[PDB]
Design a protein around this ligand. Sequence first.
Ligand code: HEM
Ligand code: HEM
Ligand code: HEM
Ligand code: HEM
Lengths: 146, 146, 141, 141
Amino acid sequence: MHLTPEEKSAVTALWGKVNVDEVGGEALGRLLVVYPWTQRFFESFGDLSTPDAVMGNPKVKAHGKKVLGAFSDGLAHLDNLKGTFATLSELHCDKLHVAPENFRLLGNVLVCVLAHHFGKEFTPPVQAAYQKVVAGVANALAHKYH
Amino acid sequence: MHLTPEEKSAVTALWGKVNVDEVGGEALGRLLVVYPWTQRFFESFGDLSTPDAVMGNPKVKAHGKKVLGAFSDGLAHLDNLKGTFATLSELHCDKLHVAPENFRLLGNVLVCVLAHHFGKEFTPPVQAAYQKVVAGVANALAHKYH
Amino acid sequence: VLSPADKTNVKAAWGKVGAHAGEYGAEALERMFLSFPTTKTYFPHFDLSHGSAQVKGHGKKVADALTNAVAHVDDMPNALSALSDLHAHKLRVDPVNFKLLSHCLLVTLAAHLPAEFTPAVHASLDKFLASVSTVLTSKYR
Amino acid sequence: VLSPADKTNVKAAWGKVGAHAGEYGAEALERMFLSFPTTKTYFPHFDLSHGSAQVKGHGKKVADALTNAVAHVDDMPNALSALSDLHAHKLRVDPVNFKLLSHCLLVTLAAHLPAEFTPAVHASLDKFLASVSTVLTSKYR
Ligand code: HEM
Ligand code: HEM
Ligand code: HEM
Ligand code: HEM
């Protein structure tokens, strides 16, 4: 992960203020609204007819907290993303059948949401560092697909 | 660039039957016709206004042979693509300003040109190894971009 | 936009495909599954082994739908309307995949149409598959 | 295809941009240059240092055309035909890049307009930058 020290440090410091529960639920909900085809993996969560239905949905919020929870544990393992997420990669390909292009979509939504929460503080350099992390996390999540 | 020994052997097998001067000309020319925006880089080459004018333009034929010669050489070093291409990568980024997407377009055109030339011998398994190979070369050419 | 020349180019090349469409569809798919393995996540209920009957049967359909769009090259959004609803509301295949199948279909035609797969034709086939892809994707959101 | 809600959403969010459009266009570029450095190859004539005046000046230009598309929302292809020509035959910027600027514009909007960037507006804004991108690349070949 060609992350620089001041990049590594830009990422970590910001992450320490993130309310994972709120952010994860906003991220997952937005993904379902902005790119509705991603709802194909979520039939049983129930009503997803409208944005309101998606943002209020508790299974959505709960699934969101869970995804970012794991993303979060990933930010501790930056020098080794592949290793940390290997079994996550397998489950995603082999039991869930989630195409990896989805992981990028979510990363891009994630970055929009961090900008939405932190504003001025989510500056151009701090964004560049996140784009790198999110692309790495997606690549590791896809590493085991064959 | 995870190439299996069977993949490397298929990639190398096929390549020995290739006439690089001819295939290089065809691929650079077909890239310029199929995706005309790539012409932005070749205004000094003269007339590029109709398919026969591109395909038969002598400057295009000579640049194609040159491009492909360097690719070939790349096929003798599948294990150190990045190093092999470091100086070219720098030139393309910082003197010629060629955006890396262009390398992927050319790879994809190259795959069809092989397909065109070899018919049946370009089996699906053989295609797949050539795709990993064009992708690694595109990545190696882009790796010094900053 | 497709031009008169494009439409002619596509009508001639596809005319040569003739009654091989089905077989070229399946080959396209097999190429797709081997080169871009992530695309297999959209056919988990499918057996993807070489020469699988499901692969064949699906190729015939793909190629049939392509053949229909050629027959209605001037009215593709209407001719393909149903396929477009299926792909947007039920299958929900992500848009980047369409490009990948298209590349494979072109490889397939190139490999079978030595004489007709000229530069001009290739360019036309490519625009054609991009138009088809755009229509199948037009109702996604 | 933009639905009425979409246009309304876009007019309202763009409405609060108001006089900062220029400054937001400049910030979007800067986010694009640093996050996706390959985009720098298209502006080898620019001083790309932070706050540089070509980036600023070009920011306003982009911002103004965006404004012009918001105002001509139901009529984009005609309102942008000239810019569409410029990109296809002179600038010749690869289509992939449109998605990178669009993403940076959205982040810029999310950073600047917190209460307005609801989930429905995000969705509409994304659909809108994409139709604009589609128009800007429709005459490429
Ligand atoms: C940031 C990238 C992502 C991470 C870190 C992540 C992580 C996780 C984790 C830790 C689980 C728990 C599975 C278990 O209990 O063993 C899970 C489940 C799941 N994830 Fe992912 N995920 C990511 C992106 C996605 C996206 C983009 C999709 C599709 C849009 C998706 C679809 C699923 C599905 C369908 C489940 C199963 C949910 C269920 O139990 O019904 N994930 N994910
Ligand atoms: C397969 C990937 C490629 C390889 C291995 C390659 C290799 C080369 C080489 C060896 C040169 C000569 C360098 C020199 O003058 O010192 C060159 C020049 C050049 N390449 Fe690349 N190239 C590749 C792809 C491309 C693509 C796809 C484009 C644009 C679409 C491009 C644009 C250029 C340009 C403009 C020159 C300079 C031509 C001139 O002399 O005026 N190249 N390339
Ligand atoms: C050239 C563009 C494509 C065309 C013309 C096309 C056309 C079709 C047709 C005719 C069907 C049959 C539906 C039925 O029985 O009524 C179908 C189904 C399907 N397509 Fe598409 N398709 C295209 C690309 C894709 C791609 C790129 C994917 C994903 C990689 C895809 C995924 C599927 C899936 C999963 C089915 C259902 C398979 C099954 O359960 O039978 N299609 N498509
Ligand atoms: C929403 C998408 C975009 C819009 C609305 C837009 C709009 C504009 C405008 C108004 C101009 C100035 C034309 C003039 O001189 O009057 C321009 C030029 C230009 N754009 Fe686009 N642009 C977009 C995306 C892009 C992207 C993605 C790139 C590539 C990264 C790009 C690269 C350029 C370049 C290199 C110029 C010429 C700048 C110069 O030489 O001063 N543009 N664009």
